[PDB]
Amino acid sequence: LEAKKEENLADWYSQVITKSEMIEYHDISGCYILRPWAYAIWEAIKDFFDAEIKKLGVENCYFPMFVSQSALEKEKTHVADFAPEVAWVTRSGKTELAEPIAIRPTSETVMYPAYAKWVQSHRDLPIKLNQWCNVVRWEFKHPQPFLRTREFLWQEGHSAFATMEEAAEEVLQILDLYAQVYEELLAIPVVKGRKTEKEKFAGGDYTTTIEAFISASGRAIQGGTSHHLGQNFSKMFEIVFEDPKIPGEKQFAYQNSWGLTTRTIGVMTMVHGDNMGLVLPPRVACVQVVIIPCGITNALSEEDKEALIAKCNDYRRRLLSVNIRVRADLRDNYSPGWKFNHWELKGVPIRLEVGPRDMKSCQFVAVRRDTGEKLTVAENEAETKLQAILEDIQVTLFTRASEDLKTHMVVANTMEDFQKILDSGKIVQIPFCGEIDCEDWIKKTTARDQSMGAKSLCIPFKPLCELQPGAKCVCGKNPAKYYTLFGRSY
């Protein structure tokens, strides 16, 4: 690794993700190749989430990606600001086509006409459906492998209830899951809260979100979102049912929608990385432990060279049997020292080092990726001790970026504190009125002193300080409705 996090972050990231065999650039910019080392992290997230939404009664499915012109345009889901970012299909070979078709940037326009058809009785509710798919949005903005890409993978859930007490409960349930993905797997602490009326999903009553901080840049980033849509789309798409014991009457259904994307892997990179390379949390690594045989020489007995290469498999065998994801790298051509480095770039949590010097002592050595600390372990304790080190790494990585968050997230009550602490490369809870103006304003004000300015992130469900009796927005005109998280974003 030539570049350094503190110094040229933009380069560091692009070097870490290539040299860890995670990403590979494609002959079309904005598009990237998810190599196995990264995909296994996505698949790890996928396994957890999938397991939890199904406990909630959600079922997976697959809708088409092609949304016809008379669909987006036929309605006004959009919110048509994004309309110049949709790609279009126009010709089948050379032969032109009847109407052009769009590539899904999201799936409301494809799914909701159908929801309308399936909801006949009130009996056909709820309808909770999820899909794991790719989506395509267009961007000329200088692209970036996990955070700013043209095609990406995600998950999008769309549920639809009779009542609102229902819909409401799910929205918060899902956001907790999205938290668990970041806090329990990825070991990334996040801030839960509600979008401002400026920022919330348009065409949807409210919008809960999960925001994480990437100190390295002093910006914060959006993790995943969970929206309550109320009746907006049902009205739009006539998803209606005859009421319960309010006969002859027409009730609109209450809807939700929530998504999480592959930016997770980018955030995970940005947060836990070294100048030594990528670092993975034990919960998501393809390989929790790598077993490398070291201490091999040109004239090492040939019957010894197969005691080593066999001792290694005993660890491999024993660890696999306690569901530790272990590879033994028994490759003849690379050095040991080469391997040490290779698996360090990739960020494998523990390196299990096996030398004959240690074999003699019926023992072995384990190296933590995060701290670098070596430990010498008895062969009869490989399971308990290594499982423990895996748990202790997860904690460390989490109880680091969280202390790193607490330093970098503070309250400021004047506007003059807020421009100092923001330029201090941090993020701030301020008193805020809520009006779009004293936000729409705030951006321009902060941008004049900073190459851009503070955005609202979320309105913390649990803000740092409680608000005091008379208290005013940073503007100085209106009173403060709620402490509100602001910062420069991604």
Positions 402 through 441 that interact with Zn ion (CB under 5 A): 433, 438
The residues near 111 (Cβ < 8 Å, ≥ 6 apart) are 63, 129, 158
What's the min distance (Å) between Cβ of 156 and its own copies?
Answer: 14
Measured over the CA atoms of residue 56, residue 59, residue 65 and residue 66, the dihedral's sign is: negative
Size of the site for its own copies (CB under 8 A): 57
Which residue bears the tokens 């049997």?
A: 321
**Closer Cβ to its own copies, 280 or 454, answer by number:** 280
What's the min distance (Å) between Cβ of 17 and its own copies?
Answer: 14
What's the min distance (Å) between Cβ of 153 and its own copies?
Answer: 6
What is the number of other CB atoms lying within 10 angstroms of the CB of residue 100? 13
What's the min distance (Å) between Cβ of 438 and Zn ion?
Answer: 2
Q: Does the protein bind Zn ion through residue 475 (CB under 5 A)?
A: yes
Residue list, annotated binding site for Mg(2+):
222
| 475 contact, one of ligand HFG, Zn ion, its own copies, none, CB 5-8 Å limit per kind | Zn ion
- Which listed residue (415, 459, 473, 485) binds Zn ion by CB under 5 A? 473
**Phi, psi (rounded to 5 degrees) for 299:** -110, 65
Burial class (CB within 10 angstroms; exposed 0-12, middle 13-18, buried 19+) of 137: middle
Burial class (CB within 10 angstroms; exposed 0-12, middle 13-18, buried 19+) of 392: middle
The Cα-based distances of 439 to 191, 400, 436 in angstroms read 19, 32, 5
**Closer Cβ to Zn ion, 169 or 197, answer by number:** 197
Positions 26 through 65 that interact with its own copies (CB under 8 A): 26-28, 31-36, 39-40, 42-43, 59-65
- Pair of tokens at residue 383: 């399971």
Residue list, annotated binding site for L-proline:
106-108, 137, 227
Residue list, annotated binding site for ATP:
137, 139, 148-149, 222, 225, 261, 263
What is the number of other CB atoms lying within 10 angstroms of the CB of residue 43? 13
Task: Spell out a b/e string for 440-471, using b for 16 or more CB atoms within 10 Å of the CB, else e.
Answer: eebbebbeeeeeebbbbbbbbeebeeeeeeee
Q: Does the protein bind its own copies through residue 321 (CB under 8 A)?
A: no
- Which listed residue (4, 10, 24, 120) binds its own copies by CB under 8 A? 24
The residue type of 207 is T
**Closer Cβ to its own copies, 86 or 377, answer by number:** 86
Checking 449-452 for CB contacts under 8 A at 24+ apart, the result is 449/419, 449/423, 450/419, 450/422, 450/423, 450/488, 452/488
Q: Does the protein bind Zn ion through residue 480 (CB under 5 A)?
A: no
Phi-psi region of 252 (alpha: psi -120 to 50; beta: other; left: phi over 0): beta
Residues that bind ligand HFG (CB under 6 A): 78, 82, 85-86, 105-106, 137, 156, 201, 225, 227, 257-259
Q: Is the peptide bond before 79 cis (omega within 30 degrees of 0)?
A: yes
Residue list, annotated binding site:
106-108, 137, 139, 148-149, 222, 225, 227, 261, 263, 433, 438, 473, 475
Positions 102 through 131 that interact with its own copies (CB under 8 A): 103, 110, 113-114, 117-118, 123, 129
Residues contributing to the site for its own copies (CB under 8 A): 24, 26-28, 31-36, 39-40, 42-43, 59-66, 68, 70-71, 83-95, 100-101, 103, 110, 113-114, 117-118, 123, 129, 133-134, 138, 150-151, 153, 331, 333-334
